[model samples]
Target chain A: NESLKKFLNTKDGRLVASLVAEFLQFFNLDFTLAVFQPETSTLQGLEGRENLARDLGIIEAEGTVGGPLLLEVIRRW
Target chain B: VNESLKKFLNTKDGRLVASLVAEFLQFFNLDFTLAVFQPETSTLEGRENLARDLGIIEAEGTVGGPLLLEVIRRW
Candidate 1:
């Protein structure tokens, strides 16, 4: 069976992605969010997202499997 | 907040919003049209509270389509 589109690829996804970006910047963090696509993600990306959500205690939010990485780290924010 | 509202309006596929909303309501004015969801809040007061918490309303009489669309369109 075909999967529904990845949440990060959807309109809502874009908004949440941007919100995450804003939150990071608002805190003066030096990183970017990178959501993973199921079809393309390797074990490392999937495991990382899963672990992050578990660590953050994200219980029921959708797209947790695709939870992004804070990349392009600069400094402060 | 404004960006979130704009994305909800532009929900092309609809399923996510349908899951989120219990019912849909529409309103209009000379300047704009408004579409909103009535969620689980059953009482009129409850619904108003939802709007207030979302920062979409302050007073019942002051709510209008154009005012919201101004921000929605701005985003």
Candidate 2:
């Protein structure tokens, strides 16, 4: 738990958490988001994470519903 | 060019990737985008298997909700 909390405080960790938050919101997984929000407090007040994801090329902008298919991003990673 | 495209699409990895993208689009209710991508009829099975096969998720560990997070963390 301590290590997990420490990771969540780092820049890369926060970015990853924020991206997950964006995905949760995008998918309308409200219940999960409700639980996830408090646990990953770094996502609080963070805006434009979707745009950041797009800029990072983790997600494409052309699609309306979903972008950055997991495999595509993972392959690049 | 056409033959190469066909050959690539027919490979196991290519099919797996297509199914993965298709599943993502379906999960988000992106029917239009799914149509544009023209994924194969079959869906990808066992996300954990795919993750493990890709060496992202640990062999014994579980990847919980919001799989994107796991992928990023592992990446």
Best by TM-score: 2
Residues forming the 10-long window of minimal summed lDDT in candidate 1 chain B: B27-36
TM-score of each: 0.21, 0.46
Q: TM-scores of the first chain across all predictions?
A: 0.33, 0.62
Candidate 2 per-residue lDDT over residues B1-75, each given as its tens digit: 234334534766555554444444344344544443343222254465655665664443433223344555555
Going through the candidates in order, the fraction of native interface contacts each one reproduces equals 0.00, 0.08
* Tens-digit lDDT track of model 2 for A1-77: 45446655666555554554554454344544554444445335444555655645554555423332333454565
* Alpha-carbon DockQ of candidate 2: 0.09
- For residues A5-65, what per-residue lDDT tens digits would candidate 1 score against the true structure? 2533444333332333333233222211121122223213223333433433445345322
* Candidate 2 off by > 4 Å: A42-47, A63-65, A68-72, A75-77, B1-51, B56-75
Report the Cα lDDT for residue A53, model 2: 57
